[PDB]
Amino acid sequence: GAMGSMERASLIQKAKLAEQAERYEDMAAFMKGAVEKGEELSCEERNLLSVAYKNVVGGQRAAWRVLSSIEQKSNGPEVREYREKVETELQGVCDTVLGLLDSHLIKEAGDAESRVFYLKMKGDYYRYLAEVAKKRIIDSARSAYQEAMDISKKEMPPTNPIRLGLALNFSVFHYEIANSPEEAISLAKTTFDEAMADLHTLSEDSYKDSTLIMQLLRDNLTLWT
């Protein structure tokens, strides 16, 4: 596309500049162009990809919720039309991310740290599609998260931040999307407890990384119990 003529390294550099400038649409477009160079992404580059699209879809989700709420309360065509406009834009972003994962980030990801990361993203962006959808979208989210969980439990320690963030998101999928609040609560507790028992093996910096995400599991359990 329009980033085809820019060097991979220049795209990565500009993604980091756009992050500093809080220009997340640009950041996402730079990272899409880097992915489309066809090379695998490093850990830092995967994180740039995810942060970029998470910020873009987050603005869309927030706006969609405002509009959906106004629409529900109002129940002219304008509120429905504009909610649909934002909804379609959100679906388009989700489709773009899923497209990058399917062509060809996941199939070329052999290491656990990269394969789990991408499968988690796949679960997340189908979850964002499910928020606005439906049964098949939910099963697509579930399937991606489950594959990621199975790999993470065999190949990563229970304190691994990627594993922790995956379990966090899968628990929210259970609570809100799958209407399985007991599964959500069970997952959050087991994940928290198995991480707690492994903190003693960590350096100070790794301890900080793992406990930050453990605090998110705790925040959810507090809202859920």
Partner: peptide, 12 residues
């Protein structure tokens, strides 16, 4: 809507 904690930027 009440939004629960998920990984990464809290951008919504």
């Amino acid at each position: 809507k009440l939004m629960f904690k998920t990984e990464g930027p809290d951008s919504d």
